[PDB]
Point group: C5
Chain length 343, copies 5
């Protein structure tokens, strides 16, 4: 008859085992090789203001512990109760760019422990992580962001512990996982982030996600409504020059609506000190609207004396402006959209 599980666990890692979790596998020999892979269950809360993003993952860690090799059962592997994780050695993996992180204990510890005949261990744990993602917003809202995730050892130096991504499918994403503001690109870069502190040299592996911001929201809520205000400023040119309060009021309100439009769009962003692509658009839209008001300043000023010579001279400005600003604004959009579509 085969050995009872209770007796087996006691002899392998319990009281009678002589197993010490404070000693690493191959303790006098070469470093432990931990093979990592992650399953991304959820990806979101991508905040420009706080410059971070949230992720829910299953972190898988694989390594060999010869002390856990067994011959008592024919099974290729054994699925163990996760309470046995406290009894075995395991890597001290932490996330270097983590701002917040927690385990999941409902309804029980969200953990998995599997051991193989030859002493291989599979250790999966569910984690929620808030990771820092420094952003370059120069091309906002046509920007593309690279958010990273660093898996590092806190206490073991490179001679004792080394991390490594799986060869096949290191990062997996849940089927049908969508982000409302971004597109998560299929290609994820993998690299080493090996750290050198004054305490020594520590293993660190990295994955980089590429996030492309979706443009459609900004067309509807930012670019189209700015067009509306610029087009509105042009109706001044089809209005009678004698109607001063109407043309001025129409010129002012477009300028002020454009400033609140511009400042309101910057409300959901961090206070960076470089020029963004949306700042260029709003600046130029503000010129075209501001020029339409200066256009009437000229029309009102040259037409002071009611002599036909000046009334017609002022009339000439409106006829030119009626064609030139719509032309000049179209020329600007050609340049603008080509620059941020080509580059």
């Amino acid at each position: 008859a085969p050995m009872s599980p209770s007796d087996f666990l006691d002899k392998l890692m319990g009281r009678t085992s002589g197993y010490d979790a404070r000693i690493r596998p191959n303790f006098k020999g070469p470093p432990v090789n931990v093979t990592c892979n992650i399953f991304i269950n959820s990806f979101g809360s991508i905040a420009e203001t706080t410059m971070d993003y949230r992720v829910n993952i299953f972190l898988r860690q694989k390594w060999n512990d010869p002390r856990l090799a067994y011959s008592e059962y024919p099974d290729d592997s054994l699925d163990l109760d996760p309470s046995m994780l406290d009894s075995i050695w395991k890597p001290d993996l932490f996330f270097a760019n983590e701002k917040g992180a927690n385990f999941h204990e409902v309804t029980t510890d969200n953990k998995l422990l599997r051991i193989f005949k030859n002493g291989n261990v599979l250790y999966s744990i569910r984690l929620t992580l808030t990771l820092s993602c420094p952003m370059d917003l120069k091309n906002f809202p046509m920007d593309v962001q690279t958010c990273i995730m660093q898996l590092e050892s806190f206490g073991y130096t490179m001679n004792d512990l080394i991390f490594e991504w799986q060869d096949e499918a290191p990062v997996q994403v849940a089927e049908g996982l969508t982000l409302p503001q971004f597109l998560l690109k299929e290609e994820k870069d993998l690299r080493y982030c090996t750290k050198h502190y004054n305490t020594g040299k520590f293993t660190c592996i990295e994955v980089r996600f590429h996030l492309e911001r979706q443009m459609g929201y900004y067309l509807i809520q930012m670019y189209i409504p700015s067009l509306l205000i610029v087009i509105l400023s042009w109706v001044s040119f089809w209005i009678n020059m004698d109607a001063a309060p109407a043309r001025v009021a129409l010129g002012i309100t477009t300028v002020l609506t454009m400033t609140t439009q511009s400042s309101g769009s910057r409300a959901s962003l961090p206070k960076v000190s470089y020029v963004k692509a949306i700042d260029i658009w709003m600046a130029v839209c503000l010129l075209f609207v501001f020029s339409a008001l200066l256009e009437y300043a000229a029309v009102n000023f040259v037409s002071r004396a009611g002599t036909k010579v000046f009334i017609d001279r002022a009339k000439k400005i409106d006829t030119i402006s009626r064609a030139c600003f719509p032309l000049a604004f179209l020329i600007f959009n050609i340049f603008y959209w080509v620059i941020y579509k080509i580059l």
Copy 2:
């Protein structure tokens, strides 16, 4: 037999019971029958794309090691501290963003065992669950929010989940949602997962949430009508009054833009066209056209000759009937489509 001695022999020191070993450990998978009582349902957020729920999660399964003959009682209600001593499933919620137990004034847990070794295990949980939303038809949209009950560590050969046949999901009497109607029919299905670590049991319940329309009539649709109707009073005003007709034309356009942008403030920044965007867009055309109407009236009437003053006067008389007509025709189409 004294309860103290009984508990010791069944699951305590003298029992030889090992909670690290599942029931029927060398045999077929443990069949866990689940049912939930929804105590509270709310915090349905479009922005963060999730909802909050307070539930009693009931789990039923058979553990032959816990069968008893010492008492005639069909079942025994045990102190929940004994839950630490017995095996139980590792149920987690796959789409959970936040979750907690309830420990006031004591652990909000229930443990009941039956003669034949059946276990009833109820626990009170608060869960924040993710609910991806399709807002194409907002605010006449209907949302499907799910809840996945999954095993983290046991594969399908060791552990299987299953909904109760009779009344798997129960809702507290008189439970109302201020923004939504929770439909009576809940879909039940399997979400069985296949990871690189293996095949894991997963069962799913889908709630159907129908957004209540009344709020948006009062705070969104009626006040937009008011601005469109306001733009039409321009057509009954004297054409000579340029500042009045222009100012009235502008303010309606700007009030309409702030109205439109303000309605999008409580929503996530999605990149598709919503039903409210169509309404505001068209309302903006009718108000913007009313201003362009005066641009025409002011332009054709430049020279004070009677021929043009009457020609300009003709535009207002047509516009007075045509925009109210055209706007009514639009509402017929709009409300019929959705």
Copy 3:
């Protein structure tokens, strides 16, 4: 007898006491008498539809195993660490959204035992309780917020809750709420629950919260009067001044819409008509009619003939008396109804 030896024999190692067994375990249900002291009452949120409270929860019951004769004292005040050694009820709050104990500087708990085995158990708790609100009469509404004390694991045959006869709910002296008046009368009743797991004891207290009106007079009703009264000054202005009368008519309409929408910002998005919606709607009619009044005046006076200029002049003289009259008549109705 030394206290150390006494505690050891009553509930410790040598006692044979088992906290997993209830008092009168083979007999009738344990009668727990509850009373609460409300230390703090506030954070009453309409949006999230809940309120926060800080209380001392007192529980009284008899455990014959804790009867003593070793000391003449009527009762003994025990160190609260002994609460872990005795049986106690599993009271939870059914409508609790959040709850916590208080551990600074030590556990905020009290344990007192009496000669005959009676136990007094007081614990300080902060609770966030759900309070579904009816805002039909807002801001002249009155709200009923409840608090349910329930057993999670014991059925009615094993455990029954009951309010004290004398002063079950006590309130700290000078406790005031800035937005509400907490009425002196609190309703007490049974909320006995029937789940598929059985029948569970539940007792309930209902607080009546009357919203204070003064804030809304100053920040909502008076400023709306100001805008309505402002619209009437148009009628004392020259009819030739089109831009002035129109601009004055528009700005009052738009100020009234932002006034109306801004007042709904601190409320949940409910789909029924509130009393404040009626007021703002009617105020909007009187302001909107004042603008339509000038549309008529400007339209009938097109040709500068004396017959129409006087006919248009007649409208203003009637309107000067009729709208102030009609608005006063509306307030008579409105304030009398609510």
Copy 4:
């Protein structure tokens, strides 16, 4: 013959450990008079004073002193001994809680922020660092020239007055960190001390109280509230120097000042709780609104009496502006004299 003094390990074991027979569940002088606990606090930080939630936050060192005869020692000549704070679990100590506490926490980084010192005669000094959010009911009648009294109640939860009594130190019970400033308030030097002895249906419990006096700084409200209101009132007066024929200009100027004043008034109430009594800022805004609203009614009169273009009425209307030009600046100055003198 001078033998070696007792080892600390053995000493702690005999005083409060295994061999001691010490029971932390029994109070000092258990069959005798009440334990006299002498309290004092050091205020490390004082802030987050919120009108809306009606509370304030404080970081303190809470010192408690009392005598436990069981902890008297003669084995060392030292007047006192500084003990590892893990020994706090082994001794009896008071059950002090803060009666008006809405939130409270200990500090465990990098170790427990606690101090335990014992004296030859059995006196104990126990200091613990706490962050507390305390409720402070506010009277805003005189806001923003209001003065607030925020209290802090130290109470026993489980011990009645016959077993436990609290008492402030005679010398310097409340100490404040040097250079501690509050941006919105001035913390007055004088702190009131008194008894808050509680009588519940569970009995009579010791309670001692400290009252802080917080005087709100006026400078912020001059710059952001009072001066900008003056600007709008002064702006309304420029109407009186404008031509009476210019109806749209005088009306538009009259309206915009009224509406700017309402948004000014409602915006100032945004950071306050929704109280149902009249505040001092409500009086100011109300009167400022009268002066601006009267300036518009002034033109209603000017426009109405001057209907027919006859010289008699045009001059009669002209007389109103000349009186108003001097009377409103006078009347507004008279109001400020009254207003600022009252508060």
Copy 5:
């Protein structure tokens, strides 16, 4: 010697080691040498007057009880669970508002011991530290944020802190702050505390944060210029156009007030004059004077006599050159001062 046996003899059961006793307990104070690695630096809030940091805190000291000769290794890297078995300093952060350890996936701690008994102890911490700010020169202000490392329980005769001589504070490569520049030079000093409980070791590091100006040029200073320049176009407009010049004068004043008040929204309510208040105040004078300029032009030109119409015309011609000049002179002064 096996590691298990070695740890048992050095600090475990057979060791006789007592973590409640400090190294050199009857002798001179323990000298703890501190150094920090700044992994992250941010959340610098003016409103709450604090900042957040993520660090590795390194502590070095000698414990002769931990000296070893059993292995030739210069040092040994120990499992961090052994930290509970050894004595270590009670370092706390005096100006800490919030602080936490990091336990994912295991305790983020490092323990290394040397032959001679030296200990290296590194722990990862997130800290929210208070940073009182002087905003007199905002937004051209420079801030000094400090970090105090103090002993809570040990007086100066038992425990002394000290910064490392070489590289006490290290910063992660490529660490940038979006609003500030973290200066390379960090001041180090002693903050030794004297309470009524005694004299306690305290060492301090001061970071110098220079606020980046570019954001405020784009979102604050340039848009204010735009409104001031807009006010000047009034001077090229016909004096007969009263509603146009007044409306243009008003809207610039009101846009400037909302501009000014909106810039103060992200700041604490301090009662001293800031540099941005001076700028907005002066910008408000130039815009307010442009409106008073027309009050003069409209008033002196009452009677249509050529003498006054030209006299009023003279004011505009002077104002057209003088305000652009005077505003340029102001900017020369302003930007040179700060």
